[PDB]
Design a protein around this ligand. Structure first.
Ligand code: ATP
Ligand code: ATP
Ligand code: ATP
Ligand code: MG
Ligand code: MG
Ligand code: MG
Ligand code: MG
Lengths: 524, 524, 524, 182
C-alpha cells in the first residue's frame, strides 16, 4: 500500500540508530563475563539470558527504518551463526564497529564506494592473516577446548565432543541425543548423513534445536516430485496402522501434497516428515539405493513403473532413528543387513576404480565413507528433560564449532586473533585515501570484540587492549580469570572458521548499509 | 512485534520500582503479626490474606519493565517455595534488601560483577554458617514445633505431623487427606511414592493444592511413549463401564494423545490422569513391576508384544487411592496381596546382596524402603469441606517443611538465624573493595527479615534488632508474645532448608538484577 | 465514491513530486556501481537490491496524485521492460529528465503541445540516429557481451547464450531451465514456440519468472472457446488418474470454465494450464494440426463433431515439457514421431510452393521454421535451487536482450549511445521556439543516464560527461573499472532495441504528463 | 539566560547549515551572470542589491546555532567590505568553501587546530604568491577595465571612474552621490 521512502542521510541515520540499539542490546552479553538481558516472555516470567542469539532474535524496533537496519544486521549475524555456529554476538559487535565508523565517514562526505572497497580489502587481508595464524585442530585437547569455549565454559561438553570426535575420525559423522539416565554413553551405530532440510518448519518437534526426531521411523524413498497426497494414502494408512513415524525422501513435495501433509502434522495421523532428495539423476538414484540398502527398504520410482499407489509396508524402509535439520538429515542405525551394506560399499569402490574424473572418484569416495563410517551416537546423561534438551543443544552447537575448527584451525580467543590481525595489517593501504580510511575503520572494528569483552568484565578496555596489542603471538586477557596470559595455555580458543565468518559477514552488512542510498517501508 | 528496549540505569530504576512495589505488598504480611492485604477477587467479595504467597501471585505491575522485575523476583520467591514450602515472603524481603542496596551501589558507580561476587561469597558463607548452627530435628517435639510454625501457629497440625512422622520414621512416606468425622485419624497402609508429575495441569481437581486425587483408580502400566488415543480406546470404554478413575503411568504422552486425553478430561468420560514413568530401562521396568505387584496389576509393554489394544480389565492395576503432584505421585494401598509384595521385596533384597556398585545397592535399598515402609495416612478431621481443604493444605505444606527440617536441621526463627549468621560473618572480605561492599549489603539483607517482622508487630525494628544482635545463641524476639526469649524454648523454629533456600534464591535474583544491563519488552 | 480533482499547475506539481520520488529511488541503482535500496519485506528481513525493477515495483506513494504519477511512470518503465527486457531504470532516469525539465517549461508558460511535439520529434530523430549508429550483432562475441551486460556482469550467462544462439541460428527457438547439478548442458529438442499467454495469472508456479512449467503434460487441442468445465470432466478425471499435468490450447477459457479451472489450480487436482489458441480460421487449425503432429495428439473440434465429452486419453497430446509465459508458450520435445513431423513440414512446403501471396508464403515459411528448427534447451548448472531460479531468470532476461540486439543491433553502453545521439541532434529544430525547447529538454534527457551512472560511481558526472561528449564514436567511461575507453572494446554494449525502447517510452510518458491538465482520484 | 549547549558534530552541522544559508544568499550574486537579491526593509521599499556584504548583513536565522554560524561567517563579508571595499561575495564564497572542506576533515578525525594552522600557512604563502603575481595598474585603460568589471560589466562606470581619477590625479578625492538625471 502506501509506503514511506527515506533517502540518503536520513536513511543512514535511521539505519545507524536501529543498528546501535540492537548492537548494544546484544553486545552487553559478549564474553564469559557478559551482562544479563531480561526478555519479556509474554505472559510468563521474564527470561534472563546471557546468550546474544536470543537477545538479537527478540529485538524488533518500533520505527520501521530503524527496525529494518536492526533486522539486516541481525540476519547477517544469523548467517554467521549458520556458517559457523558461534560468534553471532562477535559478528554484531564487529558489524556495529564498522557501521558506526563507516556511516560517520559517509556523513562526513567521503565516498561510500571507496569505503566499501577499503573494508572489503581489509577484511580479505584479515582472513588471509587469520588463516596464516590458524593452528590446526587435530589433538583431542584442542577439540575439547573448542567445545568448552563454544558451550559457554562447559568442560564436560568439550571432553565428550573430543572423545566422540577422536573415536570416529575428524571427518566422521557424529550425532547427539538424550541419554537414558544421568550418565553419558558413546556408541558407534551404522548410519549415514545426507543433506536434506525439512520442507516445512512446522515439522519441528524440538523448539530448542529446530530439528525433527523420529524413533524407529519408516523411510519412503520417493524419486518423484510429489504433487498429490492421494497416491500414498494407502501407504499412510498402513503406516498409521503400524504406528511408527513416517519420513519421506522425495525430490520435492510441492502444492497441496505439502499443505495436506502439513495439515496432517497437527492431525497426527502419523509423525509426518518430508525432506528433499540430495543428488541428481545418477547421483540421486545412487544415494537413494544406498539409503535403501542401509535401511533394508526398496527404492520406489515412477520411471521403473513402481508407483506410490502400490507401495506396501515391505517396500518401506526402516531404521532405528532419524534426525532432520534445516540443512541435513541423519539416518541412524538402519535395519539393513551388514552384508548388503558391505556389498554396496564394494560396488561403489569398484565404481571408484572404474571412475576416471576427479569429481566421480571424490563423490564415490564420499559415498563409501558415509556408508562405512556410520554415526557416533552420544547419550548425554543430564538429570532432567529440560537439562536433556539444553545440554544436548549446547553439545550440538559446540560440536558444529569443533568441526568448523578442525576444518579451518583455531586462533587465540577473546578477540586476540583480530587484535593481532589488525596489528599485522596496520600498514595496508588502498587505491585512494578513502579506501585507506575504510581499512582503518575495519582495523578498529577488529579491535572492537576484545574491547567489548573487557568492558563487560568491568575493566577498562583501553588499558587491556593496549596490553594485548603490546603482546605478541597469543598473549591476551583471560576474562574469566581477569588475568593476562597465553590463550592457548588457558584454553581460550576460537575456531578460525567462526572468527573469519563473523568478520566477513560483519564487513558484508557494513558495506551493504554504507552503500545504501534509499530505503522503502510500509507507511506507519 | 515492536518492542521497547531499556538500557542500564533506566532499566535498573524500573527494576527497583517493580521490586519495591511487589516487596512492599508482600512484606507487609511477614511474621505472625503480619498486616492484611485485600486482593480483589474480580466480581466477588475481596479476599483479605496475611499469606504472602497469594499477595505475590496477585501482583502484576502495569509498567512493562516494572512488571518484569516484579515478576521475576516473584518467580524466585516461588522457586524458594517449591524447594522448601515456606519462606516465600522471607525470600522476597531478603531479595528486596539486596536489590535495593545493590542497585544503589550500581547507580553509585561500583562494578556489578564485584557486587555479585561479594553477595555470592557472603551467601555461601551464610549457608555454611546456617549448616553449622542447624540443630538436627529428630525428636517429635521439634517436628511438632516446625509443623506448627509452618502452618502459622496451628498446634494441631504440628502435633499430628509429629505423630505420623515418628510412627513411620524420618524417611517414611506420609500422605494426608480428609477424615470421616471431625477428629484426626492415623493409619498405616501398604503404598509407595514414585516421583512423577501430571502431564497436564488441567488434571488438577484440587485448586487448593494443585493435586489430582483418584479414589480406587485403574493403574495402567505403560512402558511406551503414548502418541495416540486409539490403541487404548477399548480400555477407556472398559474403564468407563467400570466407572473407576483411570491413571496412566507412561514414559511420555506426546502428540495428539495428550490433547485427546485433555479433551476427554473436560468431557469426563473417565477421570483421566497421566503421569510420567520414573526410572529408565532396567530401573523403569523394576519400579513398574513393583507397582504391578503392589496393585495386583500386570506390566504392559510393547517390547514383549503386550500391546495396548489387547489390554483388558484384568491386566489393569487397582489400588485404594492415588495422589498426583507436579513432581511426585503417591499410590495408596494397592490391592496386590501381601505375599506378592513380600516376594518382590525379597527379590530386591537378593538383588542388593548380589549388587556390588554403591549406586545399585543404594537404589535397590531405596526401592525396598519405599515398598516395605508403607504409607502413613492422615485422615484429618474438620467441621466443613472448605475447612477440610484448608486444614489439609496447611498440613501438607507444614509436612513438607518438617521434611526439609529433618533433612537439614532447624534454626532460630523470626530471622534470628540470619542475624546470628551476619554477626558471625561480619569480618568476611572479598578480593576487592566492591566485593566487600556486596558482602555488607548481604549482611544488611540478612538483618532485613527480623526487622520486617518487628515492623509488622508495630515495635521499632532498630531497638529489637539491636537487642537480638546483642544476644547470643538463639536469643530473639517472640513477635506473637512481643517478648524476648530463647527461640527454641518458645517453639519459633525455622527449617534450615527453608532459610538457606530463601537466602540463596534472594541472592540469585539480586545478582541477576544487578548484572542486568538491558531489558526488552513488548511496546505498550 | 467522492473524488478529489486537481487542475493544471497543482496536478502537474503532484506529478513531478511523485515522479521525483520514484525516479530517485530507482535511479540510485543505475549502472554497475549502483547503490543499494532496502525494501521492507513485510515481517521478514529487508531485501537489499541494486535492481531497479524491484525498487520501482515496491514504490507506491501515499499521496493519491503523487502515487498516480509514480505509478504511470513506473508502468511506462514496465512497458520498456516488456518490450526489451532491460533498461527499466534507464527508462525511468530518462523519463524524470524530460519530465522535470518539461514540467518546468509548462510552469514557465510554454505551451504543452509545442513541448510534446518537440520531444516527439527529438526522440524520433534519436531513434533514427541510434539505428544509424547501431552495429549488427551476429558474431557470438557480441552476443556474449550483450548477455553479460544484461545479466549485470555475468560472463557465464553471456557465453552460454552465445553458444546456444550460434547453435540454432539467430532466429532459432531457445529455452532455458534447471540443469542436473552444477554443470550446464546444451541440447536441441524437437519443439516449437507459439504466442499464447496464460489465461490466469494464478497459473504461475514460478514467481521468479512469471511462467508456468509443466513436465510431461497432456495437450488438449480444443478449437472452441471453453466456457463450461462439465464437458471435459471425464478428460479431467482421466488426466488426474494418469497424474501428468494438463494444458489446454483452446481459443479461450472464460466464465464458468475459467473460474472452475482456477478453483482446480489452487486445489491442484490436476496441474491446470490454459492458453489461448494462436492463429485464426485456416491458420488456427493449421497450427493446431502442427501441434497435434508434433505431440502425437489429435485435434478435437466441435465443427467436425469431435466433442469434448468423447475426448479420451489417446486423443490428448503428449510432450516432454511446456513453458507458458504471459505472451508466448513453448512446447518441448513432443512425442510425435519424426516421420509425422517430416510429412507435415513437407505438406507445408508444398503449401509454400502453391502459395502466391507474400503473407501466405511468409507465414508457411515461419511454420516450417518453427517445426523443423526445434527448441534449444539449456540445462544451466548451479549449486542450489535458489541459484537455479536466479541464474535461469538472469539467463532468460539476458537472452531476451540478446534477441532484441540481434534484431536491432548494438550500441555503446553506459549511456554513451544517447550522448552521441544528442551530439548529432544538437542542431535539430522545430516549427516554433517551444518545440526547440522541447528538443533541448530531450537532449539533456539523453545526457541523463550516463550522468546518473557516473554519479552512482561517486565521480563527478559533469567532468565525465564532458569527456565522453568530447570523444567520438564509442569512446566512453567504463564505470566498473572507472576508466575511459572504447565501450565495444571493454564489452559495455547496449541492445539498440533496449535503448530506443527506453527513450521512446520515457518520451511517451513525459509528453503524456506534460499535456495532462486534470486529475481525478478517490478522496483520501 | 538558560543556555542550550551543543557539542561536536551536532554543533558543527548546525553552524555549517547557518553558514550555508548565508553563503547561498550571498553567492547568487557572484560574477557577471550573478543575479540580484531583494532585502525587505522595515522602513521604505525593498532593496534590490548585488553586493554580498548587504545580503550577508541582512541574514539572520531562526535557529540560534545556525544563526551563530551565519553571524560568524558574516564577519568575512563585513571585514572585506570595510578593508578593500569589494570582493565581499568572493570572501564569503571562499570562507564557506574553507569551512565546508575544513569540516569534512574535522569529521575525518583531523585535528582542527592543525587544520587551522595549515590553512593559515597556505593563505600566507598565497598572499605572497599574489604579491608576486600582481602587475601595476597605472594606465587609464586598465583602470577602466577594473571599474567595468567591478560595476558588473558596466563600461560607462569604468570609463567615468577612470576619467575622474585622471582629472583629480592621485591626490584628488572621488565621492559618489545621487543624481537627478537618467
Ligand atoms: N575465558 C575467556 N576469556 C576471554 N575471552 C573469552 C573467554 N571465553 C570465551 N571468550 C571469548 O568470548 C567470546 C565468546 O562470547 P559468547 O559465547 O558470549 O558469544 P559469541 O561467541 O559471539 O556467540 P554466541 O552468542 O552465538 O555464543 C569469543 O570471542 C571467545 O573467544
Ligand atoms: N511467634 C513468632 N515470633 C517471631 N517470629 C515468628 C513467629 N512465628 C513465626 N515467625 C517467623 O516469621 C516468619 C514466618 O512468616 P510467614 O509464615 O508469614 O512467611 P514466610 O515464612 O516468609 O512464608 P509464607 O508466606 O510462604 O508462609 C518466619 O521467618 C518465622 O521464623
Ligand atoms: N561496466 C559498465 N560501465 C559503464 N556503464 C555500464 C557498465 N555495465 C553496464 N553499464 C550501463 O549501465 C546500465 C545498466 O544498469 P542496470 O542494469 O542497473 O539498469 P537498466 O539497464 O536501466 O535496467 P534494469 O534495471 O531493468 O536491469 C546500462 O545503461 C549499461 O549500458
Ligand atoms: Mg558465543
Ligand atoms: Mg511463611
Ligand atoms: Mg539494467
Ligand atoms: Mg565587486
Amino acid at each position: 500500500a502506501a509506503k514511506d521512502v527515506k533517502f540518503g542521510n536520513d536513511a543512514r541515520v535511521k539505519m545507524l540508530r536501529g543498528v546501535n540499539v540492537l548492537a548494544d542490546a546484544v553486545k552487553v552479553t559478549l564474553g564469559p563475563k557478559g551482562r544479563n538481558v531480561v526478555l519479556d516472555k509474554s505472559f510468563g516470567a521474564p527470561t534472563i539470558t546471557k546468550d546474544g542469539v536470543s537477545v538479537a532474535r527478540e529485538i524488533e524496533l518500533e520505527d520501521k527504518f530503524e527496525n529494518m537496519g536492526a533486522q539486516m544486521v541481525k540476519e547477517v549475524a544469523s548467517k554467521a551463526n549458520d556458517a559457523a555456529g558461534d560468534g553471532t554476538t562477535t559478528a554484531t559487535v564487529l558489524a556495529q564497529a564498522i557501521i558506526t565508523e563507516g556511516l560517520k565517514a559517509v556523513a562526513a562526505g567521503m565516498n561510500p564506494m571507496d569505503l566499501k572497497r577499503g573494508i572489503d580489502k581489509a577484511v580479505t587481508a584479515a582472513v588471509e592473516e587469520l588463516k596464516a595464524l590458524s593452528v590446526p585442530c587435530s589433538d583431542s585437547k584442542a577439540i575439547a577446548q573448542v567445545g568448552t569455549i563454544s558451550a559457554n565454559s562447559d568442560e564436560t561438553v568439550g571432553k565428550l565432543i573430543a572423545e566422540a570426535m577422536d573415536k570416529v575420525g575428524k571427518e566422521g559423522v557424529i550425532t547427539v541425543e538424550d541419554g537414558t539416565g544421568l550418565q553419558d554413553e558413546l556408541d558407534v551405530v551404522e548410519g549415514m548423513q545426507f543433506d536434506r532440510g525439512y520442507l516445512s518448519p512446522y515439522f519441528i518437534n524440538k523448539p530448542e534445536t529446530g530439528a525433527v526426531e523420529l524413533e524407529s521411523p519408516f523411510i519412503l524413498l520417493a524419486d518423484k516430485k510429489i504433487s498429490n497426497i492421494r497416491e500414498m494414502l494407502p501407504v499412510l494408512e498402513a503406516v498409521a496402522k503400524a504406528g511408527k513415524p513416517l519420513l519421506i525422501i522425495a525430490e520435492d513435495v510441492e502444492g497441496e501434497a505439502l499443505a495436506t501433509l502439513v495439515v496432517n502434522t497437527m492431525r497426527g495421523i502419523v509423525k509426518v516428515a518430508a525432506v528433499k532428495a540430495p543428488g541428481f539423476g545418477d547421483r540421486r538414484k545412487a544415494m537413494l539405493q544406498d539409503i535403501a540398502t542401509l535401511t533394508g527398504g526398496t527404492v520406489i520410482s515412477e520411471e521403473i513403473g513402481m508407483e506410490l499407489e502400490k507401495a506396501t509396508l515391505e517396500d518401506l524402509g526402516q531404521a532405528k532413528r532419524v534426525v532432520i535439520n534445516k540443512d541435513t538429515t541423519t539416518i541412524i542405525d538402519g535395519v539393513g543387513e551388514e552384508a548388503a551394506i558391505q556389498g554396496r560399499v564394494a560396488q561403489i569402490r569398484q565404481q571408484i576404480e572404474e571412475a576416471t574424473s576427479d569429481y566421480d572418484r571424490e563423490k564415490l569416495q564420499e559415498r563409501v565413507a558415509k556408508l562405512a563410517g556410520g554415526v557416533a551416537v552420544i547419550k548425554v546423561g543430564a538429570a532432567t528433560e529440560v537439562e536433556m534438551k539444553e545440554k544436548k543443544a549446547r553439545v550440538e552447537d559446540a560440536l558444529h564449532a569443533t568441526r568448523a575448527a578442525v576444518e579451518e584451525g583455531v586462533v587465540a580467543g577473546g578477540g586476540v586473533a583480530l587484535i593481532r590481525v589488525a596489528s599485522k595489517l596496520a600498514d595496508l593501504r588502498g587505491q585512494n585515501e578513502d579506501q585507506n580510511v575504510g581499512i582503518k575503520v575495519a582495523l578498529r572494528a577488529m579491535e572492537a570484540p576484545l574491547r567489548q569483552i573487557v568492558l563487560n568484565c568491568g575493566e577498562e578496555p583501553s588499558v587491556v587492549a593496549n596490553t594485548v596489542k603490546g603482546g605478541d603471538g597469543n598473549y591476551g586477557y583471560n576474562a574469566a580469570t581477569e588475568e593476562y596470559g597465553n590463550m592457548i595455555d588457558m584454553g581460550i580458543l576460537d575456531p578460525t572458521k567462526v572468527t573469519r565468518s563473523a568478520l566477513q559477514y560483519a564487513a558484508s552488512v557494513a558495506g551493504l548499509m554504507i552503500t545504501t542510498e534509499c530505503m522503502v517501508t510500509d507507511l506507519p
